[PDB]
Design a protein around this nucleic acid. Structure first.
Length: 71
RNA sequence: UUUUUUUUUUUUUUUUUUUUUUUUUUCUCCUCUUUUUUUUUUUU
């Protein structure tokens, strides 16, 4: 059963990974999401998507230390 | 008015046999980063 669990998990993960495949995410209106947080880490705060349901740790600090501002 | 003679196509056939796919080289080798590892639950 635990193996089955992992199977559903990574199967749906792979199915989601192709939703974000090569088909150009630049002019088809399937690009912008929203975001809330739930936990802070020392380089990027954990993000969440209420409209799809995906998680993942992002980064504010980038490789070249070029930290973010906004216009 | 121009007679007579000068051989030709090698002889032979009534011999035994108890093996066996292939075949014979090439060295040690830096796997990058949010994690502990999540977990009940119900509709297949």
């Amino acid at each position: 059963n635990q193996a089955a669990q992992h199977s559903q998990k990574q199967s749906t993960e792979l199915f989601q990974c192709m939703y974000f495949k090569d088909k150009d995410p630049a002019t088809e209106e399937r690009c912008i999401s929203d975001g809330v947080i739930y936990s802070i880490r020392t380089n990027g705060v954990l993000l969440f998507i209420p409209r799809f349901g995906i998680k993942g740790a992002a980064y504010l600090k980038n490789k070249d230390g070029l930290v973010i501002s906004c216009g």
